[PDB]
Amino acid sequence: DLSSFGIREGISEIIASTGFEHPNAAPIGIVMKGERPFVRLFKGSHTWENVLKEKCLASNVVYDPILFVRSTFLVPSEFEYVDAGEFKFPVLKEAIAWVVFECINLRNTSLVADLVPLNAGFNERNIKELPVPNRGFNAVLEATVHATRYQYLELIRHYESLASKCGGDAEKKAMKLIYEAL
Amino acid sequence: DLSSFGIREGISEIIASTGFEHPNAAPIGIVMKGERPFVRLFKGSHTWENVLKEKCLASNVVYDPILFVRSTFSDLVPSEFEYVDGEFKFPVLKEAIAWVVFECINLRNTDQSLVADLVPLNAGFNERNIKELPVPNRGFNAVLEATVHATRYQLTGEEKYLELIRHYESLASKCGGDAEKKAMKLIYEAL
Ligand SMILES: Cc1cc2nc3c(=O)[nH]c(=O)nc-3n(C[C@H](O)[C@H](O)[C@H](O)COP(=O)(O)O)c2cc1C
Numbered sequence A: 001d002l003s004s005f006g007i008r009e010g011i012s013e014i015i016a017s018t019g020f021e022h023p024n025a026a027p028i029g030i031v032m033k034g035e036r037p038f039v040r041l042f043k044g045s046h047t048w049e050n051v052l053k054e055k056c057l058a059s060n061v062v063y064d065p066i067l068f069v070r071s072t073f074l075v076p077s078e079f080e081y082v083d084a085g086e087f088k089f090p091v092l093k094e095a096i097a098w099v100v101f102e103c104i105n106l107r108n109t110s111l112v113a114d115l116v117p118l119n120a121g122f123n124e125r126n127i128k129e130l131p132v133p134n135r136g137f138n139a140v141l142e143a144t145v146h147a148t149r150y151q152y153l154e155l156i157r158h159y160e161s162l163a164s165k166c167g168g169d170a171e172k173k174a175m176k177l178i179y180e181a182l
Numbered sequence B: 001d002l003s004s005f006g007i008r009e010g011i012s013e014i015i016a017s018t019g020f021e022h023p024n025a026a027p028i029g030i031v032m033k034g035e036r037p038f039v040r041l042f043k044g045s046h047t048w049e050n051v052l053k054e055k056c057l058a059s060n061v062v063y064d065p066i067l068f069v070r071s072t073f074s075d076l077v078p079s080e081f082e083y084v085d086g087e088f089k090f091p092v093l094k095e096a097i098a099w100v101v102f103e104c105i106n107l108r109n110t111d112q113s114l115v116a117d118l119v120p121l122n123a124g125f126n127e128r129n130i131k132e133l134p135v136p137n138r139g140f141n142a143v144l145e146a147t148v149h150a151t152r153y154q155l156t157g158e159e160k161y162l163e164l165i166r167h168y169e170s171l172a173s174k175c176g177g178d179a180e181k182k183a184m185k186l187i188y189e190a191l
């Protein structure tokens, strides 16, 4: 039941892990519009390269804005390996919940692929506080989108003030990290 | 532990319930920056009037964008609330994920706002209301922003705001589910 692992109606903003041979993480929206979940991957990214080669991707639900930003620009010790068929596949140690997916029906449009769930897990250890809407966290999320597009600088500058007004220390540090990264 | 009930560092966007004698709900940001949480209420609102008289307010954590927009632009009906416990009961939302009843203290005017610190009196969790895992969704986030800009459009009349609402409608349509798309329709109807 994908809903329990954060894969929900609309576009769920998660951190996608890929790379059996070298783990990689990057924010990705998984889309759910009534049928199988699917992804639309910008061509050229390591996520795109990994899905083409390996046809596997895992979702990682993350509420930490620092992790979102660091993954927009993670080292192997940050990943753990979980069962994906007879292979093991990297997910984030700090994931609240993960689902490993086989990527199917690959088609260029970006690269689009539908997702078939292989295995899923929940990390009780990782939920310490109750999630609550925070416009500062939302602002960091909008900044990472523009950062990725930039890879826009003017736009990132605006979100900074919302992150500073509404964010906690973690949102403020994440926004600092974006500024440093570019 | 307030973080267990959704009162976290920074400004937590919740729906505040107030009104011993007639329950009222409205989106409000509770601010936490190292000490007691506090609220900055715009003068003249129903939440403001109830805090002034009663000095009590409850946070309600809500992930439903429909309830956000309805509480912003409408009156929730008394059947949407339930009563929880010092002496006297106090209204919280039945659809709240988690609620905290606070005594409002140190009421002070600054600017065109009433500021109050918050001392928790009681708190609860509604297991029954968590059915899916929360996940960041830019459509939900767009609904939140659109509600802010819509209130400013009512302020100020500026077209700058209708243009922003249209951009957020676009994200709600792309990224949201059915609930977000319904929420945006309610914003439009309200305007
Ligand atoms: C919140 C957010 C959502 C994103 N969603 C997608 C997406 O669904 N598809 C995509 O290709 N890129 C998406 N991106 C952009 C990628 O995260 C970005 O290009 C990333 O840095 C690629 O890194 P990689 O080469 O390691 O895969 C998103 C970025 C942000 C911050």
Ligand SMILES: Cc1cc2nc3c(=O)[nH]c(=O)nc-3n(C[C@H](O)[C@H](O)[C@H](O)COP(=O)(O)O)c2cc1C
Binding pocket: B013, B024, B025, B026, B027, B028, B029, B030, B040, B041, B042, B043, B044, B045, B046, B047, B048, B071, B072, B073, B144, B147, B148, B151
């Ligand atoms: C996301 C969001 C956050 C808000 N935060 C506050 C706030 O913290 N303080 C405040 O006075 N009004 C805030 N508002 C505006 C009130 O929600 C709005 O004026 C509401 O209509 C008040 O209704 P009431 O008269 O029933 O109190 C916020 C609105 C939105 C949509």
